[PDB]
């Protein structure tokens, strides 16, 4: 029910 | 009515963006960057350790959540002061709250620091969310227009 955010960067 | 376009999000996100009325309930570290029950988990600590400190007569901090193309701003309500900011590609989990149409959270920061934001809304959680939704969307779409760019330039 939640969602990732694709533009994600750890670094 | 008329379905959303990436310049309607672009216009809505842009400079100063949107901003919703909300309190913080708190602010968890968590292990993983994403994850539906890791989420969750966390905004029941939260709301526990929240319920606790309200019995001794605490309140949530009053706050603006505001969203635009610069992420998200965590501004306290009463000096405008801006508490706590992300970019967008910092910000790597949107959760809703299955236990409470008043509440969401978001996981943000870099690897190894990845942090659980517990939100409760004043009104309806859901119209941030998909603003939240959009504005991952519409940043997607609009990177992989100049990449689909850059691929036809050779
Ligand atoms: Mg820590
Ligand atoms: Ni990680
Ligand atoms: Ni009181």
């Not at chain 2, 996100?13 to 309190?23: E, I, L, M, T």
């Not at chain 2, 968890?28 to 939260?46: C, E, H, I, N």
């Not at chain 2, 859901?126 to 959009?134: A, G, I, T």
Request: with cysteine; aromatic share 8%.
């Amino acid at each position: 029910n939640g969602f990732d955010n694709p533009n994600y960067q750890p670094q | 009515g008329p379905e959303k376009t990436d310049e309607y999000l672009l216009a809505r996100f842009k400079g100063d963006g949107v901003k919703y009325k909300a309190k913080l309930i708190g602010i968890d570290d968590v292990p993983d960057a994403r994850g539906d029950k890791m989420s969750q988990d966390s905004m029941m600590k939260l709301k526990g350790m929240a319920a606790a400190g309200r019995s001794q007569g605490q309140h949530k901090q009053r706050i603006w959540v505001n969203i635009s193309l610069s992420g998200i701003k965590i501004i306290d309500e009463k000096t405008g002061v801006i508490e706590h900011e992300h970019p967008v590609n910092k910000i790597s989990f949107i959760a809703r709250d299955v236990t409470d149409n008043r509440a969401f959270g978001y996981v943000c920061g870099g690897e190894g620091q990845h942090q659980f934001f517990a939100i409760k809304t004043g009104q309806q959680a859901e119209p941030l969310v998909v603003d939240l939704k959009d504005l991952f969307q519409v940043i997607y779409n609009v990177k992989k227009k100049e990449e689909e760019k850059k691929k036809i330039e050779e």
